[PDB]
């Protein structure tokens, strides 16, 4: 917007962290699954 | 020091009984005086063995703390505390950087110390096992009276008494004996009881009957003797010292490790000081000049590599534990793969160590029995009525019995009370005719004449199990020729017939052939006594010939031997196909040694000794060109008068070598001879007479079930199930781990470049620091760890058992070709991918690449809270630093992303991924966990403080993707060239 | 030689020359495409400069400006940087209707010169006289520090509204058009005096938004002179200058995030 362009200097680092941690966890689980296919 | 002990012993068995007493101030009848014995005790010292001085574990741990990488990491750790000290004095720095980084680095050294300490293990209790062979007490005659004393109180000169069941307390001169037999397997590896008597019977004291040795035991009878040697001075006490004293030495794998440590340490100190001066010339304060150096150290040293190696070794040892192959020393996991020569004991190693029936001669025909443990062969005969007649004599004319409670275990494995030949016959009949006890119940023995030294035969009279007869049957066995002189008829295919010169000659032929096979041959015959001349109550006199022992019916011959283990012939061939030379080294007699050599394939068909040529051509052995003989059989008595140079010529000039009737020191000498030629040697054995050889071997392998305690103490590896096929597996595993270590090392080293280059450009370009010191440790200690380990699970790219053993002088674990690829090619591509993401982060935040050159001065200036970017905006100190640390984070993640491709390319040295596939589940696990770790380290809240890791925007993750892909393509194209032309260019330049 | 023969030494050179040449050519290619995705007038991200920093002219050794009044070369270090900044706000530097403009001598509202486009020439910036900075060689005794708000493209600094309570409660509250700056230390052993545009202790909103170096060169950002004529002497005084606003925030880590950290000591 014009004088109300506050969103330009903002970033949702909170969501990014939530998503990043979700991904890291799921990649960790996936890895266990493939490894445990025989121990 | 031990050169004296490598020599054959000298003795006094040639002296008379009386003469021997003068030498030791002793009485043949009264024995020593209580006072004289105590005097000699203080004089000579105790009848005991002293363990050699060991190196304390303290010094062993700390010796690892100073090996190249640890030295550089120490210099870094201290240089951290240096810069910290210089700070705490000058400008009060409330930070924790240099202090904490110095603590972290010192911990890395200590923990890395534990890993190398675990790898360099030496579990040795040789002298302890020997000490277990000295009895607690001994029986001596002192002041004309026998008393039990502490065996350590035994001295040279006293009168000792032994009987069946006790250990020989010391080396004795036999002066009196009654039916005494002894088990000399300690000195020979052969357990057949040897008679002991006062009479001298051989110039060689290790063969004479009037000497009994410490480390052996009396098996039966009784004997008295004069002690000639005590403690360390006994024949086997010296073997003990020799074995326990032998310098261990460095393994092939250990030598390789130190070698690349020098290389990497070299480039580290090079670039280290090369840029330390390069910085001072650029006008950098010593305050900074050291900070850069610390970074250089951390970049160059692969912090997690030595521990990777250890884990890869451990994991390989775990797989072998699961095939009944125990590894005592982690490094011995690889030595077997580098082995070019195997020196093998015969008895209990190549062989089962059990007299077993091998052949039978009946119906004018040679039949072969199955000698294998698990009986993997086939039948020979069942139909012939002759067989049942021979079978009956083998069961009936036999005094051997199975021990109680064995019905659970297989026939051939069960313990038997009796001599070896009777046990063999027992197990033979029990196997192919069912319960022998049944045959001995159906035919009650009424009278017998046990085998006599003079008679050379054993006879028995039984009540024929037949109801229509119920009469008296005579059976006998003995020396083949003696049995022949007592026969008139031969049971041919059922019906008897006169013994014509024809069948008599066929007997001699059969007899000579079986004997030529190194087999012990016995004759078997029976005689159905006439009914009218022998009533149902007729008494037979065993003392005086009350019955005919002539004109009997010859039934057949039976031959026997201590046979090879089932898997042994095939394992020997497999070792030989892998280009490993196999030598036999045995305490056993030459005829037996040679026969098993041919049986297992040590001596291949057609190959001759000089003696074979001479007999065939009917010419003198001196007339034979010795170069025409590729095979040789060396008796220990001849070995004794040969110099090592002459032993070296024997080793060089023959492909098929048998060393027979060797002493324990002689086995050591043969091993050393092989090593002297530059060969990596394995020893396989099971007896205490293998202990020195096992110790000296680059790798000693002991048998687990049949092995003596001493042998297993001297070994690096134990075959817990006695499965000789495990050697073949071991060499295969050893070769595979050697290749996979290269892959894992290249992988680990490759990521050093993207950690080095940022620090260099930081100096030469004056740009903001692309990657931090902490960030490097997150790679080498964090992300790269599981992937690097996973390479240990790689399958072979080709048939590794088809290639020759590596040349330890030329074929190195880390060579110039590895460095060229890891440092010069792939690592260089990784460095760029790192920098790219760095320029991306900065440029998208307002600092375009052009304006970055020569800005670090203002960038690092803590007091300038208004640096102008390319767009004209002003940044505080902490604001721009957040972007900088975000650059460290994405550079870090870029390494991870480019290591994805590197992990896949390091999978194979030659083959394509499209050929080898992706069947390594640990590797895939590594990829997922590596990425999970990196994401966690970036997105987890609080990690921006502890590690200076900042959250990355989604687009950031993809910066290095095009570089990750170029790596995959590049290496795939390169290896395509290797395969397409075995010529050499790409091969001799980059082929690891 | 060391490794190989001359023929081999050559081939290994011909390879790495072509190899590294290609790699350099590829690296450059990826840099090209990166630049191609970026604007010339505005950076892709601005969340890392977001809350504006407040920086001053006196180059602090360590957020500190200690000196002796009874000594000449004791403050000549801080006068060097003070001069460096103010030397830019010269009238001879601001000449003609291009590219400067005379703007309200009193704090006014924002000025939009269109978009971040080159569809116009150099966007005309408001003039600023260093003569608006009353009282301030500089203050040889009791320094005359000069404040500054960090430039951010398209940033509209918004003052706080007088809805509730305020630190400098309602005094000279030019609510609509001034971004205030109140310095503080309890520990009240000083004498705060502020100088600026229109005589206000803030930043005139008529200098915003900043259009960037590419679209606005020679642009001048508003200054706020602060004088501490403290009646005290020979002691470290921790003085913090804070700016207030809707788009202004602070951090415990970044001690320059919309605030000062000055340790004055007139040890004379
Ligand atoms: C910006 O203004 C300052 C004001 O002090 C100028 O400093 C002048 O320097 C000259 C020569 O050194 C002196 O004779 C004057 O006394 C100073 N003041 C004035 C008001 O003229 C400085 O030169 C100016 N800078 C530029 C680039 O124009
Ligand atoms: C950051 C940049 C400027 C550094 C570049 C370093 C280059 C020149 C280095 C890195 C790795 C190096 C190579 C690594 C391996 C080998 C194989 C060896 O048998 C001869 C030297 C040779 C061929 C090296 C020559 C120089 C080399 C290519
Ligand atoms: C600042 O200077 C003016 C003259 O320009 C003078 O009248 C005034 O006293 C000075 N103020 C202070 C607080 O010293
Ligand atoms: K490293
Ligand atoms: K050994
Ligand atoms: K590394
Ligand atoms: Mg043996």
Domain ranges of chain B: 1-46+126-245, 63-116+246-339+725-992, 340-352+564-724, 353-563
Which is the CATH superfamily of the domain at C39-268? Answer: Na, k-atpase alpha subunit. (2.60.40.1660)
Q: B353-563 in CATH: which number?
A: 3.40.1110.10
Contact B478, B451 (CB under 8 A): yes
Burial of B309 from C-beta contacts in 10 A (0-12 / 13-18 / 19+): buried
CA distance A21 to C211: 38
Rounded (to 5) percent helix, strand, coil in chain A: 70, 0, 30
Question: Quick check: C124 contacting B, CB < 8 Å?
Answer: no
CA distance B206 to B213: 9
Question: What would be the CATH architecture of the domain defined by B1-46+126-245?
Answer: Distorted Sandwich (2.70)
Sort residue B10 into left (φ over 0), alpha (ψ -120 to 50) or beta. beta
For residue B486 the two structure tokens come to 């007592």
For residue B507 the two structure tokens come to 């007997």
Shortest CA gap A8–chain B (Å): 13
Helix (H) or strand (E) holding B189: none
Q: Is B658 helix (H, G, I), strand (E, B) or coil?
A: strand
Q: Which residue of C has its CA nearest to B970?
A: C19
Instruction: For residue B952, list chain A residues with Cβ-Cβ distance below 8 A.
Output: 20
Atom of ligand 3 nearest to the CA of C229: 13
Is B340-352+564-724 the same fold as B1-46+126-245?
Answer: no
CA distance B284 to B263: 29
Interface test with A, best of B921, B930, B942 (most A CBs within 10 A): B921
DSSP string covering B578-612:
TT-EEEEE-SS-HHHHHHHHHHHTSS-TT---HHH
Axis crossing angle, helix B753-765 with helix B827-844, rounded to the nearest 10: 50
Note the ligand closest to the C-alpha atom of B717: 5
CA-closest candidate to residue B212, choices B148, B167, B156, B178: B167
Q: Which residue has the tokens 């041959």?
A: B521
Burial of B630 from C-beta contacts in 10 A (0-12 / 13-18 / 19+): middle
Q: How many CA atoms lie within 13 A of B581 on its CB side?
A: 21
Phi, psi of B141 (to 5 degrees): -105, 110
Sort residue B284 into left (φ over 0), alpha (ψ -120 to 50) or beta. beta
Spatial CB neighbours of B171, under 8 Å, sequence gap ≥ 6: B211, B212, B213, B214, B227, B228, B229, B230, B233, B234, B235
Q: How many CB atoms lie within 10 A of CB B469?
A: 12
Question: What would be the CATH architecture of the domain defined by B340-352+564-724?
Answer: 3-Layer(aba) Sandwich (3.40)
DSSP string covering B345-384:
-IIIIIB-SS-EEEEEEETTEEEE----TT--S----SS-
CB contact under 8 A, B921 and A27: no
- Resolution in angstroms for this experimental structure? 2.8
Q: Which fold has domain C1-38?
A: 1.20.5
The ligand 3 site (C-beta within 6 Å) comprises: C 135, 229
Residues of B designated as active site:
345
Instruction: For residue A25, list chain B residues with Cβ-Cβ distance below 8 A.
Output: 932
CA distance B886 to B359: 82
Binding residues of B: 209, 303, 345-347, 419, 422, 451, 456, 477, 520, 586-587, 686, 690, 716, 751, 755, 780
Residue C79 Cα to ligand 3 middle (Å) = 19
- The residue whose CA is least distant from atom 7 of ligand 1 is C87
Radius of gyration over alpha carbons of chain A, in Å? 19
Angle at C248 between CA C245 and CA C253, to 5 degrees: 145
Interface of A with B in 5-34 (CB under 8 A): 11, 13, 16-17, 19-21, 23-25, 27-28, 30-32, 34
Residue B746 Cα to ligand 6 middle (Å) = 9
Q: How many CB atoms lie within 10 A of CB B401?
A: 15
| Long-range CB pairs of B856-865, under 8 A, 24+ apart, other chains included | B856/B762, B856/B766, B856/B767, B856/B768, B856/B769, B857/B766, B859/B768, B859/B884, B860/B768, B862/C62, B863/C59, B863/C60, B863/C61, B863/C62, B863/C63, B865/C53, B865/C54, B865/C55, B865/C256
Contact C150, C52 (CB under 8 A): yes
Residues in chain B whose beta carbon is closer than 8 A to a beta carbon of chain A? 921-922, 924-925, 927-929, 931-933, 935-936, 938-941, 951-954
Instruction: For residue C7, list chain B residues with Cβ-Cβ distance below 8 A.
Output: none
For chain C, the structural domain boundaries read 1-38, 39-268
Nearest by CB to residue C156, choosing from A5, A10, A11, is A5
Residue B928 Cα to ligand 4 middle (Å) = 22
Shortest CA gap A31–chain C (Å): 32
Helix (H) or strand (E) holding B678: none
Q: Which residue of B has its CA nearest to A31?
A: B925
Pairing of strands B699-703, B867-868: unpaired
Q: Which fold has domain B63-116+246-339+725-992?
A: Calcium-transporting ATPase, transmembrane domain (1.20.1110)
Pocket probe mutation, ligand 1, options C84, C90, C92, C218, max atoms within 8 Å of Cβ? C90
DSSP state of B632: E
Residue C226 Cα to ligand 3 middle (Å) = 13
Contact B332, B681 (CB under 8 A): no
CB contact under 8 A, B882 and C61: no
Contact B687, B345 (CB under 8 A): yes
CA distance B587 to B658: 11
Pocket probe mutation, ligand 3, options C133, C134, C135, max atoms within 8 Å of Cβ? C135
Q: Where are the alpha helices (DSSP H) in B218-284?
A: 235-245, 252-281
DSSP string covering B817-876:
HHHIIIIIIIHHHHHHHHHHHHHHHHHHTT--HHHHTT-HHHHS-TT---EE-TTS-EE-
Sort residue B208 into left (φ over 0), alpha (ψ -120 to 50) or beta. beta
Which residues are paired to B477 by β-bridges?
B458, B524
For residue B178 the two structure tokens come to 């009654």
């Amino acid at each position: 917007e014009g004088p109300d362009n506050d969103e330009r200097f903002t970033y949702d680092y909170y969501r990014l962290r939530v998503v990043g941690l979700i991904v890291a966890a799921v990649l960790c689980v996936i890895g266990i699954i493939i490894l445990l296919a025989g121990k | 020091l031990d050169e004296l002990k490598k020599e054959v012993s000298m003795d006094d068995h040639k002296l008379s009984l009386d003469e021997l007493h003068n030498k030791y101030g002793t009485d043949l009848t009264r024995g020593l005086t209580n006072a004289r014995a105590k005097e000699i005790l203080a004089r000579d010292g105790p009848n005991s063995l002293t363990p050699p001085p060991t190196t304390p574990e303290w010094i062993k741990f700390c010796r690892q703390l100073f090996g190249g990488f640890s030295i550089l990491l120490w210099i870094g750790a201290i240089l951290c505390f240096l810069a910290y000290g210089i700070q705490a004095a000058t400008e009060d720095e409330p930070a924790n950087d240099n202090l904490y980084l110095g603590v972290v680095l010192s911990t890395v050294v200590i923990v890395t110390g534990c890993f190398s300490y675990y790898q360099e293990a030496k579990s040795s209790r040789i002298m302890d096992s020997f000490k277990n062979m000295v009895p607690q007490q001994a029986l001596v005659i002192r002041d004309g009276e026998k008393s039990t004393i502490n065996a350590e109180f035994v001295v040279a000169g006293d009168l000792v008494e032994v009987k069946g069941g006790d250990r020989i307390p010391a080396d004795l001169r036999i002066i009196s004996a009654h039916g005494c037999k002894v088990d000399n397997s300690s000195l020979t590896g052969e357990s057949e009881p040897q008679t002991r008597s006062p009479e001298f019977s051989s110039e060689n004291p290790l063969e004479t009957r009037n000497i009994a040795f410490f480390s052996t035991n009396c098996v039966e009878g009784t004997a008295r003797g004069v002690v000639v040697y005590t403690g360390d001075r006994t024949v086997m006490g010296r073997i003990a010292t020799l074995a326990s004293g032998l310098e261990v030495g460095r393994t092939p794998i250990a030598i390789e490790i130190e070698h690349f440590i020098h290389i990497i340490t070299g480039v580290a100190v090079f670039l280290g000081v090369s840029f330390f001066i390069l910085s001072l010339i650029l006008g950098y304060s010593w305050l900074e000049a050291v900070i850069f150096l610390i970074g250089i150290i951390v970049a160059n040293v692969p912090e997690g590599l030595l521990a990777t190696v250890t884990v890869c070794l451990t994991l390989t040892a775990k797989r072998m534990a699961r095939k009944n192959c125990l590894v005592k020393n982690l490094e011995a996991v690889e030595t077997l793969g580098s082995t070019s020569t195997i020196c093998s004991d015969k008895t209990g190693t190549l062989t089962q160590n059990r007299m077993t029936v091998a052949h039978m001669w009946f119906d004018n025909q040679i039949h072969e029995a199955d000698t294998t443990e698990n009986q993997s062969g086939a039948a020979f005969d069942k139909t012939s009525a002759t067989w049942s007649a021979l079978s009956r004599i083998a069961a009936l004319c036999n005094r051997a019995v199975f021990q109680a409670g064995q019905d659970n275990v297989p026939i051939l494995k069960r313990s038997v009370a009796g001599d070896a030949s009777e046990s063999a016959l027992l197990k033979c009949i029990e196997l192919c005719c069912g319960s022998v006890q049944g045959m001995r119940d159906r035919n009650p023995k009424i009278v017998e004449i046990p085998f006599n030294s003079t008679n050379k035969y054993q006879l028995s009279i039984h009540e024929n199990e037949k109801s229509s007869e119920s009469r008296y049957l005579l059976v006998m066995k003995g020396a083949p020729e003696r049995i022949l002189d007592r026969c008139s008829t031969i049971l041919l295919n059922g019906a008897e017939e006169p013994l014509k010169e024809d069948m008599k000659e066929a007997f001699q032929n059969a007899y000579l052939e079986l004997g030529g096979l190194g087999e012990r041959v016995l004759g078997f015959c029976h005689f159905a006594l006439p009914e009218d001349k022998y009533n149902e109550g007729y008494p037979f006199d065993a003392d005086e010939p009350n019955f005919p022992t002539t004109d009997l019916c010859f039934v057949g011959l039976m031959a026997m031997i201590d046979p090879p283990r089932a898997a042994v012939p095939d394992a020997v061939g497999k070792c030989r196909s892998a280009g490993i030379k196999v030598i036999m080294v045995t305490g056993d007699h030459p005829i037996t040694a040679k026969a098993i050599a041919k049986g297992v394939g040590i001596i291949s068909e057609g190959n001759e000794t000089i003696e074979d040529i001479a007999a065939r051509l009917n010419i003198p052995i001196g007339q034979v060109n010795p170069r025409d003989a590729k095979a040789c059989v060396v008796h220990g008595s001849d070995l004794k008068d040969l110099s090592t140079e002459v032993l070296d010529d024997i080793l060089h000039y023959h492909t098929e070598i048998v060393f027979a009737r060797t002493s324990p020191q002689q086995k050591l000498i043969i091993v050393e001879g092989c090593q002297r030629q530059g060969a990596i040697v394995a020893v396989t054995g099971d007896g205490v007479n293998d202990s020195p050889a096992l110790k000296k071997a680059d790798i000693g392998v002991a048998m687990g079930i049949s092995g003596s305690d001493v042998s297993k103490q001297a070994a690096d590896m134990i075959l817990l199930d006695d499965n000789f096929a495990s050697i073949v597996t071991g060499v295969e595993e050893g070769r595979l781990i050697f290749d996979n270590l290269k892959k894992s090392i290249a992988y680990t080293l490759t990521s050093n470049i993207p950690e080095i280059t940022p620090f260099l450009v930081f100096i030469i370009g004056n740009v903001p620091l692309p990657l931090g010191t902490v960030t490097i440790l997150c790679i080498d200690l964090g992300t790269d760890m599981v992937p690097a380990i996973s390479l240990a699970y790689e399958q072979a790219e080709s048939d590794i058992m088809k290639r020759q053993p590596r040349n330890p002088k030329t074929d190195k674990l880390v060579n110039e070709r590895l460095i060229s690829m890891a440092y010069g090619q792939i690592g260089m591509i990784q460095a760029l991918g790192g920098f790219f993401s760095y320029f991306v982060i900065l440029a998208e935040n307002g600092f375009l690449p052009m304006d970055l050159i020569g800005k670090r001065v203002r960038w690092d200036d803590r007091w300038i809270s208004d640096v102008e970017d390319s767009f004209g905006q002003q940044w505080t100190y902490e604001q721009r630093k957040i972007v900088e640390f975000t650059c460290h984070t994405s550079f870090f993640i870029s390494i991870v992303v480019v290591q994805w491709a590197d992990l896949i390319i390091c999978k194979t040295r030659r083959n394509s991924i499209f050929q080898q596939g992706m069947k390594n589940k640990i590797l895939i696990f590594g990829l997922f966990e590596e990425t999970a770790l990196a994401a966690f380290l970036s997105y987890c809240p609080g990690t921006d403080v502890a590690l200076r890791m900042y959250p990355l925007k989604p687009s950031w993750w993809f910066c290095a993707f095009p570089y990750s892909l170029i790596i995959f393509l590049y290496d795939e194209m390169r290896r395509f060239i290797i395969r397409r032309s075995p010529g050499g260019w790409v091969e001799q330049e980059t082929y690891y | 030689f060391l490794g190989r023969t001359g023929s081999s030494w050559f081939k290994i050179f011909l390879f790495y020359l072509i190899f590294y040449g290609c790699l350099a050519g590829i690296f450059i290619g990826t840099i090209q495409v990166l630049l191609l995705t970026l604007s010339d007038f505005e950076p892709k991200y601005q969340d890392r400069v977001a809350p504006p920093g407040l920086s001053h002219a006196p180059y602090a050794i360590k957020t500190e400006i200690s000196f002796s009044i009874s000594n000449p070369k004791s403050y000549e270090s801080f006068v060097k940087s003070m001069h460096k900044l103010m030397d830019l706000y010269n009238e001879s530097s601001q000449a003609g209707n291009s590219p400067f403009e005379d703007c309200s001598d009193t704090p006014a509202d924002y000025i939009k010169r269109g978009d971040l486009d080159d569809s116009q020439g150099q966007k005309k910036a408001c003039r600023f006289s260093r003569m608006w900075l009353k009282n301030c060689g500089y203050a040889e005794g009791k320094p005359c520090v000069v404040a500054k708000l960090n430039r951010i493209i398209g940033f509209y600094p918004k003052p706080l509204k007088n809805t509730t309570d305020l630190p400098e409660e309602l005094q000279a509250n030019y609510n609509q058009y001034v971004l205030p700056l109140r310095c503080a230390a309890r520990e009240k052993i000083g004498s705060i005096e502020y100088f600026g545009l229109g005589g206000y202790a803030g930043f005139p909103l008529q200098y915003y938004p900043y259009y960037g170096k590419r679209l606005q060169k020679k642009y001048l950002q508003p200054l706020l002179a602060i004088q501490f004529t403290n009646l005290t002497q020979n002691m470290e005084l921790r003085i913090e200058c804070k700016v207030y606003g809707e788009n202004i925030d602070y951090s415990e880590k970044d001690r320059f995030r919309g605030r000062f950290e000055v340790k004055i000591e007139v040890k004379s």
